[PDB]
Design a protein around this ligand. Structure first.
Ligand SMILES: [NH3+]Cc1ccc(F)cc1
Ligand SMILES: [Ca+2]
Length: 223
């Protein structure tokens, strides 16, 4: 996250870190046995780390649970990033408390102008690199689809929205991939892609989770 603030330990209790020997992507706990993330984060051998603040220090609230099954959206296109969403089932159910909690799925799509919380352990610099050990947070609005399509000509599908600042300076970034965009207590987006980070007129692009609620529900009912 570029231009954000330190969230505070366990103040984003649905935030997960996906680990394959190191943190490589964020994700969101949607019930005690399922995580949603970005399909471009797919990897074999994923361990899900819950209750994390410092990802390099064991602090007492962590739950490390291995994935038993991963399901990439049946129409994911890695070239255009359309349908960049994946579900991960945990080997055993997470123990839920104030610090490890699931986030609700939306029953409505959120509108442009809605303020949201984006969070992750990704890069904090627009030019150059520096990865935080503790979770970072950013409040950003959803942008109109016409300014989103004007920023990314011929690249935005109906399964994507832009959120952030056309002025730049504040944005998600590499390593924040797969992580949550929560608006009014509901998961509305998944950190997906963009042109670099915190650049002028290149806001973040997010998977539109409200389009996928019935694929998610029927997939977790059957697996
Ligand atoms: N600035 C949006 C963005 C998000 C994630 C990423 F991996 C690269 C760019
Ligand atoms: Ca830790």
């Amino acid at each position: 996250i570029v231009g954000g603030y330190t969230c505070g330990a366990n103040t984003v209790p649905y935030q997960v870190s996906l680990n394959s020997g190191y943190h490589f992507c964020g994700g969101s706990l949607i019930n005690s046995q399922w995580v949603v993330s970005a399909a471009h984060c797919y990897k074999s051998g994923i361990q899900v780390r819950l209750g994390e603040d410092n990802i390099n220090v064991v602090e007492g609230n962590e739950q490390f649970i291995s994935a038993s099954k991963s399901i990439v959206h049946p129409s994911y296109n890695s070239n255009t990033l359309n349908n960049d969403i994946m579900l991960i089932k945990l080997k055993s159910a997470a123990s839920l408390n104030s610090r490890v909690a699931s986030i609700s799925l939306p029953t409505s799509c959120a509108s442009a102008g809605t303020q949201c919380l984006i969070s992750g352990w990704g890069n904090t610099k627009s030019s150059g690199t520096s990865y935080p050990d503790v979770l970072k947070c950013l409040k950003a609005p959803i942008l109109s689809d016409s300014s989103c399509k004007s920023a990314y000509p011929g690249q935005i599908t109906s399964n994507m929205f832009c959120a952030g600042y056309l002025e730049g300076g504040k944005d998600s970034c590499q390593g924040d991939s797969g992580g949550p965009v929560v608006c009014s207590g509901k998961l509305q987006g998944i950190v997906s892609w963009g042109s670099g980070c915190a650049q002028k007129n290149k806001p973040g692009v997010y998977t539109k989770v409200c389009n996928y609620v019935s694929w998610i529900k029927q997939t977790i009912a059957s697996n």
